[PDB]
Amino acid sequence: SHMVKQLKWRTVNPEETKAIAKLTAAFAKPGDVLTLEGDLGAGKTTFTKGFAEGLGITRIVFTIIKEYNDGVLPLYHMDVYRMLGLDEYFHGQGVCLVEWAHLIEEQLPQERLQIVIKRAGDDEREITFTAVGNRYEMLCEELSRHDN
Ligand SMILES: Nc1ncnc2c1ncn2[C@@H]1O[C@H](COP(=O)(O)OP(=O)(O)O)[C@@H](O)[C@H]1O
Ligand SMILES: [Mg+2]
């Protein structure tokens, strides 16, 4: 392929993972699409809870789709495990956070921010952001300048 830009974090506890998600949500825009990958127990739900908190959402954060409009931006959290018409959400005006998105690769927009959470060694996690498209390179650049 061509080159992709990435950010990579290491987190040693779920609060650090939530903090990264909170930072990311602060700079999301309509209609961003974030895919969220990682093995069972890696921390995708944990990430998603922190993302919702970063949008100012105060409730749950699986039912294929679930929607939140109480924040600064609507959040369409999806868990496509297992296996349409998702296109209205992807081109909506909120943020789509798509867990296990690779199970519906054929339906995804070409551009997205791919988030992968991997277990590394101890109880630790490595979270990689991969920008696919100029919008998501700009998002990652904003996150890097505002690294708390
Ligand atoms: N650095 C970390 N980031 C996220 N979760 C962590 C971390 N370290 C330990 N955990 C624990 O791993 C589990 C992740 O659960 P969950 O987010 O539901 O995983 P998934 O949604 O990927 O199946 C939780 O018990 C969480 O507290
Ligand atoms: Mg999950």
From Swiss-Prot:
GO BP field: tRNA threonylcarbamoyladenosine modification
Keywords: ATP-binding, Cytoplasm, Magnesium, Metal-binding, Nucleotide-binding, tRNA processing
Annotated residues for binding of ATP: G41, A42, G43, K44, T45, T46, D123
GO molecular function, one term: ATP binding
A single cellular component GO annotation: cytoplasm
Pfam families: TsaE
Entry keyword Cytoplasm: yes
Positions of Mg(2+) binding: T45, E99
Signal peptide: none
Knocked-out gene: effects: Cells lacking this gene exhibit significantly reduced growth in rich and minimal medium.
Note: The four proteins YwlC, TsaD, TsaB and TsaE are necessary and sufficient for tRNA(NNU) t(6)A37 threonylcarbamoyladenosine biosynthesis in vitro in B.subtilis.
Family the UniProt entry places it in: Belongs to the TsaE family.
PANTHER family in the record: TRNA THREONYLCARBAMOYLADENOSINE BIOSYNTHESIS PROTEIN TSAE
Record function comment: Required for the formation of a threonylcarbamoyl group on adenosine at position 37 (t(6)A37) in tRNAs that read codons beginning with adenine. Is involved in the transfer of the threonylcarbamoyl moiety of threonylcarbamoyl-AMP (TC-AMP) to the N6 group of A37, together with TsaD and TsaB; this reaction does not require ATP in vitro. TsaE seems to play an indirect role in the t(6)A biosynthesis pathway, possibly in regulating the core enzymatic function of TsaD. Displays ATPase activity in vitro, which is modulated by the oligomeric status of the protein.
Protein name: tRNA threonylcarbamoyladenosine biosynthesis protein TsaE
The species this protein was found in: Bacillus subtilis (strain 168)
High-level lineage: Bacteria, Bacillati, Bacillota, Bacilli, Bacillales
